[PDB]
Symmetry: C4
Subunit: 166 residues, 4 copies
């Protein structure tokens, strides 16, 4: 029971990683109900008293949730860009043109890596200029991403800057 909770947290991280990714990339309709597995995060929400023993554990958890929200935003971004694609506008067409794989199109690995890279650059406020929103849906998604990204950036990194002394 002492080490059961760490394994439970690792498996909940696994399922919270691989449910949105599958539901956003691998469909290419009753299987959509599998998205309800995300409710398992309440276990790690309620086990904070046991998880927060060490400050390095809190830093690892903060990095993990930042990466997790980046992954979820990447999945949403790919879903948005995939809905518009079969209807040179949109990020998927530009990505296919850039890597020399005209839309066929880029492989799933390339699309996921591009989406995660764009989401990380937006959340960290770098904006490399390689990937830029170009449609109304993409622009509104970007606006929401920067809003909640300012919020989560402030909260997460203020917590980190408070803990680092400890």
């Amino acid at each position: 029971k002492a080490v059961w909770d760490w394994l439970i947290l690792l498996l909940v991280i696994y399922t919270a990683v691989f449910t949105p990714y599958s539901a956003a990339f691998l469909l290419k309709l009753i299987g959509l109900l599998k998205t309800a597995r995300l409710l398992r995060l309440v276990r790690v929400a309620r086990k904070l008293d046991r998880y927060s023993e060490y400050g390095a554990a809190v830093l690892f958890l903060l990095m993990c949730t930042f990466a997790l929200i980046a992954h979820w935003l990447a999945c949403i971004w790919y879903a948005i860009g995939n809905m518009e694609q079969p209807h040179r506008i949109g990020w998927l067409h530009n990505l296919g043109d850039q890597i020399g794989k005209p839309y066929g199109g880029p492989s799933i690995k390339d699309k996921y890596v591009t989406a995660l890279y764009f989401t990380f650059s937006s959340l960290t406020s770098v904006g490399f200029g390689n990937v830029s929103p170009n449609t109304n849906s993409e622009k509104i998604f970007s606006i929401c991403v920067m809003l909640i990204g300012s919020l989560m950036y402030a909260s997460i990194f203020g917590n980190v800057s408070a803990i680092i002394q400890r």
Copy 2:
């Protein structure tokens, strides 16, 4: 009375959102603003026999100038309705009773400044439009709608997106100032956004720990 002032705050936020938009993007329904101004007249009637002179000596004039209809550049006089923000500024103690309320107020004012700067950005872009240098021409080309050009929705979304990116210090590169007026306004927006982040999110860090 608390519910009344919270509803007053909601209506103040509504008019602050909808006045600059109608000033800039419109003038190329009215039932909502008619209801809002009628309800604000009801509020000023509530705010006023012994305390009427005290209120008249205090904040009566500021509300009065912001409550007189301008029905008779001619249509631009409605920008004076933005003065109602001090109605919320004067009673900030009531709103600062909870940490969540302060957090929501900070986010709301950040979005409100972004909206106001978006309206100013569109006004700057439009005043130079009839003179491929401005941002409106680039927007038209990128969206595949070369200059009727982009619609009102596309133009507002692009202005808000550029303003949010500049304030948050992302700089996506899709929209970049190209004329001197755009460059100066962008410098001002960068300073405003730096101040926004510093002050607001220092306050946010202060609240979250408690």
Copy 3:
């Protein structure tokens, strides 16, 4: 005498703004220059009869060096007028009592550092101009003034906008370094910004906490 210090501070701000700008751009009004020189001569005269010996060893040499005209490129020696900053540097006791004064000083030093970096950026971009890779060629190509070339106003606004975007961590992508000297200067600007942005905005957050 009571208000002489703030007038001297304003004069120092003026010369700090207009000496690097003149040296970097206008080398290829004199009345205000003469007025400023006469005002500084008056200041050094009244700064002084048993205390003259104390000043002779204290700060007279620096003020005398910064006050002597160099007219006999003779204009490059006029950069010595930038030495007047020690007058406000040493008098920090008076200027650090009002919190609003401290905030205004921080804003002015941010703007001054950005202006100096813009002047250095233009000097770098112009020293390599006669040698399609520099930022001046791209600026001329993108604003519709192909090299001729852009006006002085356009060049200054572009340089200041690039410097502000670099210091504020926006990086708009309109102006991007494309030469070894430009890239090295951009790295130096990145380091100086990492220090100065953090320090100044931490101080500003501290004042806001008050």
Copy 4:
């Protein structure tokens, strides 16, 4: 002995700068490297009859590993000199008293992390040229030296400039990752840059108050 400690710190900085640069770029002078090796041999000799037992069972293994010549890939095997950083990491007491030497050390480790990331970035980029995709091809196109391509100076300056921009969250848009390896490396660089910003410059904000 303090002079010896500071000289050893300077030599540690030198080797941490020049062995990864050599490994990344110069593969496919030596007098200074030989002098530094002899100096570190002198240092490990100095590190030593009652005290030799403590050193032999203490830090002698790491120092011996970092001091044994590998002149029998040798160019890649010379990287084993990077373990000399423990020699400064284990004497942090001596380098924490000036109150500004530690700030200089923070700036130096900023520059060192940026330089190492630049070396890794160039190592990633150069391995893909045999296989207009890649940052080296774009660099060649931009600076007007199409792929023989850019010189070693241009490649190093571009790599360091991109790494600094990524860490400092500017993203100038001149250099942008395009391959999966470049994108993943950039993701990692952004993450470590954010974390290092938080930690290191929280420490810097704490230190600048004194």
